Amino acid sequence: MVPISPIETVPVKLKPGMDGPKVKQWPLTEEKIKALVEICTEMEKEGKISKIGPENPYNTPVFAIKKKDSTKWRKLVDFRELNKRTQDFWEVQLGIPHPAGLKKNKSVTVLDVGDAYFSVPLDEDFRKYTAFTIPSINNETPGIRYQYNVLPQGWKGSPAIFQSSMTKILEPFAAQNPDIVICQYMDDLYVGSDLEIGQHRTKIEELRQHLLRWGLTTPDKKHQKEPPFLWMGYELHPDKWTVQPIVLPEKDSWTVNDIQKLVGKLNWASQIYPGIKVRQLSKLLRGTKALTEVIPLTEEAELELAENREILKEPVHGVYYDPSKDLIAEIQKQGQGQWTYQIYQEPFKNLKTGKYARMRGAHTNDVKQLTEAVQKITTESIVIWGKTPKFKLPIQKETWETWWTEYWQATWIPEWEFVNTPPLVKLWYQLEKEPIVGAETFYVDGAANRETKLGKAGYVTNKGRQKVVPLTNTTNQKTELQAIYLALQDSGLEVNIVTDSQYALGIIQAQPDKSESELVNQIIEQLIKKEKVYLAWVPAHKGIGGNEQVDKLVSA
Amino acid sequence: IETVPVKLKPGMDGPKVKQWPLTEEKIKALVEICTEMEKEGKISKIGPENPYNTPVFAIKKKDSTKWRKLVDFRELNKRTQDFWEVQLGIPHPAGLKKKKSVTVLDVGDAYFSVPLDEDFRKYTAFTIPSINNETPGIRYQYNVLPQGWKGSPAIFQSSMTKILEPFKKQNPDIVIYQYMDDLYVGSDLEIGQHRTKIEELRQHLLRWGLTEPPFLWMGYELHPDKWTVQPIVLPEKDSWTVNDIQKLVGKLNWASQIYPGIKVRQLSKLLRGTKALTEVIPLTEEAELELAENREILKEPVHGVYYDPSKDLIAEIQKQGQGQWTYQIYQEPFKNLKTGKYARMRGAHTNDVKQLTEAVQKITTESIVIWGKTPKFKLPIQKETWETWWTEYWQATWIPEWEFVNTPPLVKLWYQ
Ligand SMILES: Cc1cc(/C=C/C#N)cc(C)c1Nc1nc(Nc2ccc3scnc3c2)c2nc[nH]c2n1
């Protein structure tokens, strides 16, 4: 005997106060029963299971499935119930690595571990919960009883406990071999390094050695695998990576489910295929929750899709991380609150790419969106490379300065430089800080009757200019805005406006440059045309003449 | 040598909080730190049978180059039962906020000499992540009292009142307060033998600890006596324009939500008419007088303004431009318990978030001194910008709560 270290067992408890499973064994055809008895006999021989008494009162049903085009049956135990009653675990799979964060590996070897898996024992006191019964021929006998000794396939803790047990074994090898990288995927270990391929198979032989210490063999009659490697939807090669081939279907009939699977692929692909747009395709998804609903494509959706197919007409690759060189991120405005980015280290060799969608709001502006994008990219880059990329951004240094220096919120982007590739992001208008001298002063106001929906909006000025317009199907908030719009419309290039609307102020102090309220847009459009605009607020109903004058005028 | 029994509040499970992305430098630091901690029995590796997690990161303390580990026990702390099984509470030293010099000491390291209740350990689980989730996360749990946990000052308190018995009795004029890993030491003397009394207070934590400490040599220097509150002030002009008067009235209308006898009748009456904003209005006697009466009112205190430890402290912050920030602490709207302003934020003249972060820390420190609890902040910043950067600037061992403000307050003016 070559003595072998035990895989240390992991103590597993049932959920608090809950008890195990007691589920009716399903009646089985004689054919399936014979099938199961064979399967379990061999498994018992392998130490995977053990016969139990009639004491153990737990049951999980078991089943038989004939593999398609194989006369063979396969055994399937339905742990769904026991999973519902087994505790929570610290699952590790939560984060999958992202190809762009890897380093190039000259040699990458693939080892099989479908046999190491069963070298992982199940906690002694928990085995009883895994009980099951193969029924007997004609129920003329007590159904044979079996319980598990290894992590059962399809149990809650199997993956978490399997993963962790392996890591625990691999840790000293990995740590004394810092020029090696190991990864766990299905029943398989993948090990790469960056050495000449003689020095590399050495270290594999060293690993096969190390694994043997726990009585583990990893078949040297290895796999037909060659580049690329299909893995978590990608295509990994020794020196590059891309998404697993993206093909956009042709259709003369697009449905809610059809377009859904079309954005998923576009979103998924947008991580390496540059300039990929969604929006007008996820627009057609708005609200409608019938998965079969044949939605019509706008003439924006067809042109966006035809912009996609053109980008997906040929493959592009991302590189791998070269820790020695800088990380750059570059963003572009795409309109309709769409941003698109590339992260790269040397010109044109992207590591990955992406898109950012504006946040669902009612008012917004380009500078805000760019910021949000920058932050999304920042967190993404911390996750993948452990650092913040340097930004190249289509916004003048001067514009950003004016923005953050005058914005009411705190704001920041990390190290960055201006990149002159239109459309540049700009501030469209800037409100005065003090009243303007020689500029006409417009006192505005608006009011509506909450029931009739009628109200009026208008202004009066120091120069005797007046207006009151009447309005149907409006609200107080709409009339206060409309009033401001009149004042902008009827004034010269410089103007002072006084309002009592907290609501209105709040919208314009957010400095939006696009809105969903066409009324706000009109105001923005007016603001853009002006040379100087001072907006001043005063409290309502305090008889501030000027204000009072037009309040009495619009509450008529 | 023997642990204190601990449990969570009834009906509440332990913390399961996502770990958030860490930079490479913070990972390296954390790995080295935890390697030594585990090597000293302060923490131990744990398995998958532990569903619990608390976030973790690294900071460099104020004027120091050494990385500190900082766990974010905010969730564990809400879910940790409250601590009344010897004491019924520490009747907050109302004299601490009245000293010429209050110094703040990192005594957190003393905690690690006391073991944690073996049954409670699972609840302190934390993960040092890996870049790109390549390697799997290192999972540790605590075997001792942890820095940042609500329980640590409570459990260790038995032992701390001890260590202080000498120095305390031998210096009965000093007020001493403990909040988390911080020890607040308030003298009334001169900064130089402050740096003597503080110096000799270090001794005991060495002296006791013998029967090196990492950030024990550190000292924060406050002055609650030169702590500047704020009144509300109206301008004093020779010439008032219509704009000047409109703003004045706006401000006064606002103070009236706070102060009772505030009147704007006579002042508005000057604003009778549709005048040009930049036009000068001379004041009437009736108005100059009403303005003067209003001034008298703003000088007095607010009425019926009480702290109630049963309740939450709320902190609002407004950005005023050019490095200045203004803030208010309260429990009921318009009943400020404290207001303040911050005017030249250190090494951050081009970084709004660094400033805002240091601001949040100063206000918290002040709130610990005055009320022995932290406030819940209302920050003028998008959640996503703040959530991305505040760790890079954080230099305190505790962490407050905060929510976000996405609508520009008019109130910003009234405090400028
Ligand atoms: C070694 C490895 C293999 C695989 C393959 C999965 C499949 N099928 C997937 C991953 C994530 C890894 N892990 C890994 N991988 C790295 N590089 C790499 C580089 C090229 C190829 S081709 C197939 N696998 C790889 C892996 C790497 N560099 C630094 N740390 C790293 N960790």
PDB file of N, CA, C and O in Angstrom, chain B residues 181-216:
ATOM      1  N   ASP B 181     -13.290  51.125  17.973  1.00  0.00           N
ATOM      2  CA  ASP B 181     -11.869  50.910  18.217  1.00  0.00           C
ATOM      3  C   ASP B 181     -11.193  52.181  18.697  1.00  0.00           C
ATOM      4  O   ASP B 181      -9.984  52.213  18.902  1.00  0.00           O
ATOM      5  N   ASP B 182     -11.979  53.233  18.868  1.00  0.00           N
ATOM      6  CA  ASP B 182     -11.437  54.534  19.209  1.00  0.00           C
ATOM      7  C   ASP B 182     -11.608  54.856  20.678  1.00  0.00           C
ATOM      8  O   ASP B 182     -12.643  54.561  21.281  1.00  0.00           O
ATOM      9  N   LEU B 183     -10.586  55.473  21.252  1.00  0.00           N
ATOM     10  CA  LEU B 183     -10.667  55.924  22.629  1.00  0.00           C
ATOM     11  C   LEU B 183     -10.493  57.422  22.634  1.00  0.00           C
ATOM     12  O   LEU B 183      -9.487  57.934  22.142  1.00  0.00           O
ATOM     13  N   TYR B 184     -11.471  58.129  23.179  1.00  0.00           N
ATOM     14  CA  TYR B 184     -11.455  59.579  23.104  1.00  0.00           C
ATOM     15  C   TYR B 184     -11.041  60.180  24.448  1.00  0.00           C
ATOM     16  O   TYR B 184     -11.701  59.953  25.472  1.00  0.00           O
ATOM     17  N   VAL B 185      -9.952  60.948  24.442  1.00  0.00           N
ATOM     18  CA  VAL B 185      -9.343  61.421  25.683  1.00  0.00           C
ATOM     19  C   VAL B 185      -9.297  62.945  25.773  1.00  0.00           C
ATOM     20  O   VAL B 185      -8.502  63.597  25.096  1.00  0.00           O
ATOM     21  N   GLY B 186     -10.145  63.499  26.628  1.00  0.00           N
ATOM     22  CA  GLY B 186     -10.323  64.933  26.708  1.00  0.00           C
ATOM     23  C   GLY B 186      -9.757  65.601  27.946  1.00  0.00           C
ATOM     24  O   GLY B 186     -10.273  65.451  29.058  1.00  0.00           O
ATOM     25  N   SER B 187      -8.692  66.364  27.726  1.00  0.00           N
ATOM     26  CA  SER B 187      -8.045  67.151  28.764  1.00  0.00           C
ATOM     27  C   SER B 187      -8.568  68.590  28.772  1.00  0.00           C
ATOM     28  O   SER B 187      -9.449  68.945  27.993  1.00  0.00           O
ATOM     29  N   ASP B 188      -8.009  69.427  29.639  1.00  0.00           N
ATOM     30  CA  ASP B 188      -8.328  70.852  29.620  1.00  0.00           C
ATOM     31  C   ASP B 188      -7.049  71.690  29.584  1.00  0.00           C
ATOM     32  O   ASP B 188      -7.087  72.915  29.707  1.00  0.00           O
ATOM     33  N   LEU B 189      -5.920  71.017  29.367  1.00  0.00           N
ATOM     34  CA  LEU B 189      -4.600  71.632  29.541  1.00  0.00           C
ATOM     35  C   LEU B 189      -3.961  72.289  28.292  1.00  0.00           C
ATOM     36  O   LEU B 189      -4.638  72.973  27.514  1.00  0.00           O
ATOM     37  N   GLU B 190      -2.650  72.099  28.135  1.00  0.00           N
ATOM     38  CA  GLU B 190      -1.875  72.718  27.057  1.00  0.00           C
ATOM     39  C   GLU B 190      -1.352  71.633  26.142  1.00  0.00           C
ATOM     40  O   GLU B 190      -0.824  70.631  26.621  1.00  0.00           O
ATOM     41  N   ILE B 191      -1.473  71.850  24.834  1.00  0.00           N
ATOM     42  CA  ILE B 191      -1.167  70.829  23.822  1.00  0.00           C
ATOM     43  C   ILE B 191       0.141  70.044  24.025  1.00  0.00           C
ATOM     44  O   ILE B 191       0.261  68.914  23.557  1.00  0.00           O
ATOM     45  N   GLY B 192       1.097  70.636  24.742  1.00  0.00           N
ATOM     46  CA  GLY B 192       2.412  70.042  24.943  1.00  0.00           C
ATOM     47  C   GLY B 192       2.480  68.924  25.975  1.00  0.00           C
ATOM     48  O   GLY B 192       3.118  67.890  25.736  1.00  0.00           O
ATOM     49  N   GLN B 193       1.844  69.130  27.129  1.00  0.00           N
ATOM     50  CA  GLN B 193       1.719  68.055  28.116  1.00  0.00           C
ATOM     51  C   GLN B 193       0.393  67.338  27.930  1.00  0.00           C
ATOM     52  O   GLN B 193       0.043  66.420  28.685  1.00  0.00           O
ATOM     53  N   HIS B 194      -0.350  67.788  26.926  1.00  0.00           N
ATOM     54  CA  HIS B 194      -1.330  66.930  26.310  1.00  0.00           C
ATOM     55  C   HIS B 194      -0.476  65.802  25.779  1.00  0.00           C
ATOM     56  O   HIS B 194      -0.602  64.673  26.232  1.00  0.00           O
ATOM     57  N   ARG B 195       0.457  66.131  24.886  1.00  0.00           N
ATOM     58  CA  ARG B 195       1.496  65.187  24.474  1.00  0.00           C
ATOM     59  C   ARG B 195       2.437  64.850  25.633  1.00  0.00           C
ATOM     60  O   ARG B 195       3.662  64.874  25.481  1.00  0.00           O
ATOM     61  N   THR B 196       1.851  64.587  26.797  1.00  0.00           N
ATOM     62  CA  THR B 196       2.538  63.982  27.927  1.00  0.00           C
ATOM     63  C   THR B 196       1.508  63.055  28.542  1.00  0.00           C
ATOM     64  O   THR B 196       1.727  61.850  28.630  1.00  0.00           O
ATOM     65  N   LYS B 197       0.366  63.616  28.926  1.00  0.00           N
ATOM     66  CA  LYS B 197      -0.745  62.808  29.419  1.00  0.00           C
ATOM     67  C   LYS B 197      -1.190  61.748  28.404  1.00  0.00           C
ATOM     68  O   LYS B 197      -1.434  60.598  28.779  1.00  0.00           O
ATOM     69  N   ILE B 198      -1.280  62.123  27.127  1.00  0.00           N
ATOM     70  CA  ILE B 198      -1.541  61.129  26.088  1.00  0.00           C
ATOM     71  C   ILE B 198      -0.380  60.148  26.056  1.00  0.00           C
ATOM     72  O   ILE B 198      -0.585  58.934  25.981  1.00  0.00           O
ATOM     73  N   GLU B 199       0.835  60.677  26.168  1.00  0.00           N
ATOM     74  CA  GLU B 199       2.027  59.855  26.103  1.00  0.00           C
ATOM     75  C   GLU B 199       2.020  58.813  27.214  1.00  0.00           C
ATOM     76  O   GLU B 199       2.282  57.637  26.959  1.00  0.00           O
ATOM     77  N   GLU B 200       1.684  59.225  28.434  1.00  0.00           N
ATOM     78  CA  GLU B 200       1.661  58.268  29.540  1.00  0.00           C
ATOM     79  C   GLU B 200       0.441  57.345  29.530  1.00  0.00           C
ATOM     80  O   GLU B 200       0.461  56.287  30.161  1.00  0.00           O
ATOM     81  N   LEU B 201      -0.605  57.721  28.801  1.00  0.00           N
ATOM     82  CA  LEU B 201      -1.746  56.828  28.664  1.00  0.00           C
ATOM     83  C   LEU B 201      -1.419  55.665  27.732  1.00  0.00           C
ATOM     84  O   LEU B 201      -1.984  54.578  27.865  1.00  0.00           O
ATOM     85  N   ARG B 202      -0.511  55.889  26.788  1.00  0.00           N
ATOM     86  CA  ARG B 202      -0.064  54.813  25.903  1.00  0.00           C
ATOM     87  C   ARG B 202       0.529  53.676  26.716  1.00  0.00           C
ATOM     88  O   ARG B 202       0.289  52.500  26.429  1.00  0.00           O
ATOM     89  N   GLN B 203       1.293  54.058  27.737  1.00  0.00           N
ATOM     90  CA  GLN B 203       2.011  53.127  28.595  1.00  0.00           C
ATOM     91  C   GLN B 203       1.211  51.905  28.977  1.00  0.00           C
ATOM     92  O   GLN B 203       1.616  50.782  28.682  1.00  0.00           O
ATOM     93  N   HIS B 204       0.063  52.129  29.600  1.00  0.00           N
ATOM     94  CA  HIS B 204      -0.767  51.036  30.085  1.00  0.00           C
ATOM     95  C   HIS B 204      -1.061  49.965  29.020  1.00  0.00           C
ATOM     96  O   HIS B 204      -0.960  48.776  29.307  1.00  0.00           O
ATOM     97  N   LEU B 205      -1.394  50.377  27.798  1.00  0.00           N
ATOM     98  CA  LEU B 205      -1.704  49.418  26.728  1.00  0.00           C
ATOM     99  C   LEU B 205      -0.479  48.641  26.252  1.00  0.00           C
ATOM    100  O   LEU B 205      -0.594  47.524  25.732  1.00  0.00           O
ATOM    101  N   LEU B 206       0.689  49.254  26.407  1.00  0.00           N
ATOM    102  CA  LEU B 206       1.931  48.508  26.359  1.00  0.00           C
ATOM    103  C   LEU B 206       1.983  47.714  27.675  1.00  0.00           C
ATOM    104  O   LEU B 206       1.705  46.514  27.672  1.00  0.00           O
ATOM    105  N   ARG B 207       2.278  48.401  28.787  1.00  0.00           N
ATOM    106  CA  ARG B 207       2.355  47.807  30.139  1.00  0.00           C
ATOM    107  C   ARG B 207       1.417  46.627  30.387  1.00  0.00           C
ATOM    108  O   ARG B 207       1.852  45.567  30.844  1.00  0.00           O
ATOM    109  N   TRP B 208       0.137  46.809  30.082  1.00  0.00           N
ATOM    110  CA  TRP B 208      -0.812  45.710  30.184  1.00  0.00           C
ATOM    111  C   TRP B 208      -0.546  44.620  29.143  1.00  0.00           C
ATOM    112  O   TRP B 208      -0.588  43.431  29.464  1.00  0.00           O
ATOM    113  N   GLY B 209      -0.268  45.029  27.903  1.00  0.00           N
ATOM    114  CA  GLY B 209      -0.117  44.103  26.786  1.00  0.00           C
ATOM    115  C   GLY B 209       1.068  43.154  26.868  1.00  0.00           C
ATOM    116  O   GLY B 209       1.118  42.143  26.159  1.00  0.00           O
ATOM    117  N   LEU B 210       2.026  43.490  27.730  1.00  0.00           N
ATOM    118  CA  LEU B 210       3.193  42.649  27.980  1.00  0.00           C
ATOM    119  C   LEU B 210       2.818  41.409  28.805  1.00  0.00           C
ATOM    120  O   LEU B 210       3.464  40.365  28.700  1.00  0.00           O
ATOM    121  N   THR B 211       1.762  41.530  29.610  1.00  0.00           N
ATOM    122  CA  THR B 211       1.285  40.428  30.454  1.00  0.00           C
ATOM    123  C   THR B 211       0.186  39.606  29.780  1.00  0.00           C
ATOM    124  O   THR B 211       0.206  39.395  28.569  1.00  0.00           O
ATOM    125  N   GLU B 212       4.627  44.142  19.095  1.00  0.00           N
ATOM    126  CA  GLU B 212       4.368  45.575  18.994  1.00  0.00           C
ATOM    127  C   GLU B 212       2.942  45.842  18.508  1.00  0.00           C
ATOM    128  O   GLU B 212       2.394  45.054  17.733  1.00  0.00           O
ATOM    129  N   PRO B 213       2.327  46.941  18.997  1.00  0.00           N
ATOM    130  CA  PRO B 213       1.023  47.465  18.560  1.00  0.00           C
ATOM    131  C   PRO B 213       1.139  48.352  17.308  1.00  0.00           C
ATOM    132  O   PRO B 213       2.091  49.140  17.194  1.00  0.00           O
ATOM    133  N   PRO B 214       0.167  48.232  16.382  1.00  0.00           N
ATOM    134  CA  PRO B 214       0.273  48.743  15.005  1.00  0.00           C
ATOM    135  C   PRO B 214      -0.053  50.234  14.826  1.00  0.00           C
ATOM    136  O   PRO B 214       0.690  50.954  14.149  1.00  0.00           O
ATOM    137  N   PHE B 215      -1.154  50.682  15.415  1.00  0.00           N
ATOM    138  CA  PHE B 215      -1.591  52.064  15.260  1.00  0.00           C
ATOM    139  C   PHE B 215      -1.897  52.658  16.630  1.00  0.00           C
ATOM    140  O   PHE B 215      -2.753  53.539  16.768  1.00  0.00           O
ATOM    141  N   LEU B 216      -1.185  52.162  17.640  1.00  0.00           N
ATOM    142  CA  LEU B 216      -1.347  52.646  19.002  1.00  0.00           C
ATOM    143  C   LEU B 216      -0.622  53.977  19.180  1.00  0.00           C
ATOM    144  O   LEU B 216      -0.999  54.793  20.025  1.00  0.00           O
TER     145      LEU B 216
END
